[PDB]
Amino acid sequence: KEDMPPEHVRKIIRDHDKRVYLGALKYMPHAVLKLLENMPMPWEQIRDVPVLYHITGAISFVNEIPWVIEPVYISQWGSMWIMMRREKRDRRHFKRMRFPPFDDEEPPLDYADNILDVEPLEAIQLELDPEEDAPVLDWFYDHQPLRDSRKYVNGSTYQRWQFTLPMMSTLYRLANQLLTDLVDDNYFYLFDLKAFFTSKALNMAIPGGPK
Amino acid sequence: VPGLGRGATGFDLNDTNYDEFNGYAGSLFSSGPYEKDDEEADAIYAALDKRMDERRKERREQREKEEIEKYRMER
Amino acid sequence: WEKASGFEESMKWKKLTNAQRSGLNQIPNRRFTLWWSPTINRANVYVGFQVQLDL
Amino acid sequence: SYMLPHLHNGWQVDQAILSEEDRVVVIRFGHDWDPTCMKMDEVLYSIAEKVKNFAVIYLVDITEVPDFNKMYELYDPCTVMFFFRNKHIMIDLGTGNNNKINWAMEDKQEMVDIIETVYRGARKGRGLVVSPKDYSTKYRY
Amino acid sequence: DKSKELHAIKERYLRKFVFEWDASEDTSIDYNPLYKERHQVQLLGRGFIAGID
Amino acid sequence: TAQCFLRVDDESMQRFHNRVRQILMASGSTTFTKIVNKWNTALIGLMTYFREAVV
Amino acid sequence: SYQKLLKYYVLNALKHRPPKAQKKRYLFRSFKATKFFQSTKLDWVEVGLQVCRQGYNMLNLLIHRKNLNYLHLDYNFNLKPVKTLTTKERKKSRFGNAFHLCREVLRLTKLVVDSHVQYRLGNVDAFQLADGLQYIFAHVGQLTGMYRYKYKLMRQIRMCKDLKHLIYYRFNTGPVGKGPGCGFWAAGWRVWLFFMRGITPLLERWLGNLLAR
Q1: In B, which residues are within 8 Å of G34 by CB distance?
Q2: What are phi and psi of D82, to 5 degrees?
Q3: What CATH code is carried by the domain that includes residue D122?
Q4: CA–CA separation, B5 and G33 (whole Å)
Q5: Would residue D36 count as lying in a domain?
Q6: What segment(s) does the record annotate as region Important for branch point selection (chain C)?
Q7: CA E23/CA G4 separation, integer angstroms
Q8: Looking at beta carbons, which residues of chain G come within 8 Å of D75?
Q9: Are G97 and B55 inside 8 Å of each other by CB?
């Protein structure tokens, strides 16, 4: 079962006994969930993904899963937060979209025509100084950071993420803004999961906690 | 003969056939328009559904049978 | 005021059915509503449902 | 049970409406499966031998004869409607409309009184008989 | 405060789709000052909370 | 030498509430005047029996 | 908002029943094994646009095969009746709560896909795209209007509101004051992804029951 180029699927979609189409339509929510899960991150400009184009063409589901290394994702989130804070504090004339798209009744824009041609604008990629970001300069931004580094990652399946100590130090430095910078868990005394469970079970209320 | 012969007028959308969850009953696709290709597509879809429903099917079926046997004592 | 004397005897000296008896017993309710109608028919007493009597 | 013979055929039901003219014809369009129609049938059986000399009550199944539920639009699970000499009398229940009862009347006396009032109104010819009841409310407290 | 503390001591001895959770359902109204104005987590003068500037 | 604090027994209050509930439920087709008279009689009895304890 | 988030966490923790032993059957791999499915690779924006078009077509099929041609589904997935209808047609115009929830979910997905397309069409900046995603996830119950379809989703809406309040009150400090530039949307995205994953079996069962024989 060899794969096929996406051009054939796009042509079928733009071109397409109602038995086969009706029979396979029963899995649209799964496709919606897959599309929601496989949405691009802010660090990525264009995120190519593999999908399952139905022969009838009723529903196409993204077969991929969004497996990402936890420290890399945390570093990306911290860099995005820093860049967003900078842009907000600088571009005070911020005009959020804050509105539904213009297609109230307009036909859906052809992704081949109005989406496969224009080069997208630069994403939110925080500047990387090679003085302290050298060990993670190239590994900081990618759809899958270590999809090929056999030494660092398990491989294509992306099941193991074992990096060197300097790489993890650089990742923590690039993400220390979103980290709570705690040392001893004793700072959350009478505010842990066990404390909340005991408060709920005793019909009491920890002032800093829920009821 | 229709009811018009009685000379009566007003003053499957029945309320019993309707519900809050899943709306009204019945299938929006009429069972009439089927064919051999329809048979093949239905067979493939049903096989896929059965395969995707066999994860805990054995344990669930055994537990449900035990529960039905227990309920037969008081029902 | 004619206490329970608006009609002859509201057909009490008769052998009418239960529905007629219920209607006769509910007739004083209509009179009581009519007596205090101006205090109850005000648009500030009920919700706005202005309806004009025909002709 | 359901001693009242349900008119299976729609045309048979229509002819039954045209059969009797000197009494009251009440058709129970409720489906016999539902418990509400079972309670309606029980209430009818309570007044089966009472209003018999003044009325002729028949059952009906909207699944058997669908034309009644599609032309008269009886969408309720068990709606009680009346037809007197090819004239569907309206009971002034006060529930917005007057084509059906739409309520599982568990009181035999109330049903008997409603039947008597409907007969009196049909004799008087009033197409909208004033029901001697406050059906607009639940009548419970 | 003080009267509230005494009342609390005595007590211990004896539809509509609401979008935003109203402030009535909030907690942390403590009569005692020690459990209301508590020293923050100053990480030895070299750390602080996350997210904030 | 003392002070005999008094209060209506919960049984009496339950009986009064049951009587009020019955009057409201068994009103039915009775005229509003009849229901008002029944309520007035019940209130008069309750207030005249527990003259002081009703407060 | 913090107290409500803590309540949600404590509820999800106290009810942490360990998962059951499944037979490990992959629905996606099963559909891949099926001869009625192909495989390719395409950008997330193109796939999202295709999914939005497919969902619109499916909604049109569900609102057209039933002979209810007196209503129309807008390109924003907001179905509006074409004109007046009778009581028989009103009962024919009965839209189940499952149908309403599916329509709201499809509208949210189409809005997200179109926002991504506009980000990839040069209409707005990437930071503007992040702000738009934050708006399309947090404070989106008004935009989606899914609360009426399923009242249970109001808990998720309140959780998203609390997450938005926390993210705002944390990020919008110092030089960056109150404004629309907050583009931290991972929390709301996670909450709505969890809600969609939970909702999926019910809607899938309803859709499968609809298309039988």
Answers
A1: 44, 48
A2: -120, 150
A3: 3.40.30.10
A4: 60
A5: yes
A6: 11-24
A7: 11
A8: 91
A9: no
Question: Quick one: closest CA in D to B2, which residue?
Answer: D11
Q: What are phi and psi of G40, to 5 degrees?
A: -155, -170
Cα separation, A176 vs G175, in Å, equals 20
CB of C55 less than 8 A from some CB of D: no
> Which residues of chain E lie closer than 8 angstroms to A81, CB-CB?
51
Is D25 among the domain residues? Answer: yes
Q: Please report, in angstroms and rounded to a whole number, the separation of the first and last CA atoms in chain C.
A: 30
Q: How was this structure determined?
A: cryo-EM
- Scanning every residue of chain A, which has its alpha carbon at the shortest distance from the alpha carbon of E42? A182
CA angle, residues G7, G12, G17, in degrees to nearest 5: 150
Nearest to A101 among G114, G183, G207 (CB): G114
- What lies within 8 Å, CB to CB, of G66 at 6+ separation is B28, G92
With 0-12 / 13-18 / 19 or more C-beta atoms within 10 angstroms meaning exposed / middle / buried, residue A201 is exposed
Q: Which of B3, B10, B11 sits opposite D10 (nearest CB)?
A: B3
Which H or E element spans position G73?
strand G71-73
- Between CA G140 and CA G154 the distance in angstroms is 11
Range of the domain at D112: 2-136
DSSP-derived secondary structure letter, A54: B
CA G91 to chain D, closest CA, distance in angstroms equals: 9
CB A147 within 8 A of CB A153: yes
Task: Evaluate whether G65 touches A18 at the Cβ level (below 8 Å).
Answer: no
Both structure tokens of A24: 């396979």
* Degrees to nearest 5, angle at CA F8 with F6 and F9: 110
A186 Cβ neighbours under 8 A, 6+ residues apart: none
Please check whether residue D141 lies inside any domain of the structure: no
Handedness of CA D93, D94, D97, D103 (dihedral sign): negative
Q: What is the helix (H) or strand (E) element at residue G80, kind and residue range?
A: strand G79-81
The count of domains in chain D is 1
- Report CB contact under 8 Å: E17, G151: yes
Between strands D55-59 and D24-28, the pairing is parallel
The runs of H, that is alpha helices, within chain G are 2-14, 27-33, 44-62, 87-92, 97-120, 126-137, 141-144, 153-171, 186-210
Residues 6+ apart with CB under 8 A from E12: none
Q: What is the resolution of this structure in A?
A: 6.1
Task: Find chain A residues with C-beta within 8 A of B35's C-beta.
Answer: 17, 19
Which of the 8 DSSP states describes residue A49?
Answer: E
